[PDB]
């Protein structure tokens with residue numbers, strides 16, 4: 366029942382890997398303590414292998430089965446459609462890993478006969494063969510972090526031709542089933558603002574609110590074959606075309622449940638018997654399984670009025686308190702149940718009586734004030750990682766611009782407005798690349814976005830209040846100021862100064878650029894403006910933006 370088995374072959378890199386923070390003429394204006402920022406590489410793959418490799422034991426009781434039965438009952442009301450090859454192709458990221466059969470993502474998006482013909486041959490094989498393990502590539506991801514150094518995370522994915530097939534059979538499923546099964550408990554249906562709203566209202570729904578976050582130790586590795594088959598049983602409850610049922614069964618048996626691992630050099634590194642992190646069902650599967658175990662655990666632990674918020678492996682639970690004494694006890698029972706379900710906690714869960722102190726999805730609720738002086742709740746986070754990555758993308762061009770995603774997701778925060786917005790717009794101006802579309806990710810899905818559209822985008826997602834929030838909490842302000850000292854980032858007072866210049870520079874550009882300067886930096890000037898709704902805002906088609914999670918799902922949503 367081990368999560369993995371290795372042969373001894375090393376996880377090899379597919380190209381050159383950089384560990385040290387690249388430095389250019391712009392780096393110092395943002396961050397000075399360069400030694401604190403690094404990128405993980407395959408050099409540490411071995412350390413990760415040991416952490417994610419362990420035996421899984423599972424004891425399923427009646428609470429587990431009762432929840433699953435309820436989940437299946439809801440899933441039976443879902444009707445999902447098969448995606449055509451062309452539709453699946455359009456969902457493929459322009460720069461997705463190329464196939465090992467003579468074609469790349471570019472060929473897929475263009476519907477080249479070579480790509481389409483191979484995809485049809487892969488689809489045909491899936492329908493006729495439901496036993497042969499599908500090959501997968503295992504790689505060490507290159508992610509940037511701030512020291513205090515974690516080993517590189519592993520990524521496992523099937524060939525491009527197979528990924529297109531997953532879309533055809535399961536895209537509609539993983540996109541609509543979760544919300545139906547988990548209702549308001551499914552986190553990916555909320556934008557940052559709706560997320561905070563659901564958290565605050567739930568916290569109020571309890572006479573004596575009590576909540577906590579639950580972090581499973583290497584969730585992917587705790588996912589057993591049973592969990593993956595139970596996930597397929599849930600998918601099968603949907604009203605599907607017989608052809609989709611066969612493909613889903615085949616993908617489950619041949620890919621999701623497990624398979625051989627091949628490094629970039631073509632060598633067999635071993636075998637996987639747990640969750641593959643690079644498949645379309647990774648997000649949906651983790652979410653369903655976490656919600657299943659956690660819901661069953663809540664009953665086993667005897668938690669009153671348990672409301673949950675689940676995002677993949679990230680779990681948040683809010684319920685009626687029963688005294689710090691009983692609360693601590695119930696939590697331990699919960700943890701015990703989760704452990705029995707094969708989902709032990711990396712870090713022991715602690716009860717919280719302060720909403721703002723609960724951290725979920727690396728975020729926490731906080732409060733600020735609008736133009737009216739009204740207390741307003743918003744979503745924020747520790748800016749350490751966002752700033753380290755911003756530093757990296759400052760001197761290195763990356764496939765995914767985290768700074769852009771962070772601005773969109775945390776536009777209302779103190780750090781994103783004063784630092785991220787100021788710094789990157791300053792750069793875009795100097796290079797005259799304000800209207801150049803950039804790729805970023807939101808809930809795992811890849812989006813192509815032009816910086817000049819940030820004003821309209823933010824207005825639609827967060828409202829006009831985002832452009833005028835003030836008087837942040839002492840806790841939030843202090844966490845930011847501390848993070849800057851740690852990384853050697855100039856104080857906020859410096860950023861305010863720079864923003865005045867960036868703002869005036871944008872206003873001078875006029876048009877699109879003027880709108881940015883006016884709305885994005887209205888906080889920099891002493892005498893703020895009026896800031897009225899933006900006409901183009903509505904024209905924006907931000908539908909599939911916050912519907913579901915697609916982490917590792919190789920999904921692209923052309924904007």
Ligand SMILES: *SC(Nc1cc(C(F)(F)F)cc(C(F)(F)F)c1)C(C#N)C(N)=O
Pocket residue numbers: 556557560648676677678679725726727728744746774808809914916
């Ligand atoms: S927990 C989670 N998704 C998620 C990540 C982040 C951040 F800050 F880490 F980038 C912020 C949010 C938000 F804004 F609160 F909704 C959500 C995932 C998992 N597991 C995931 N796969 O996206």
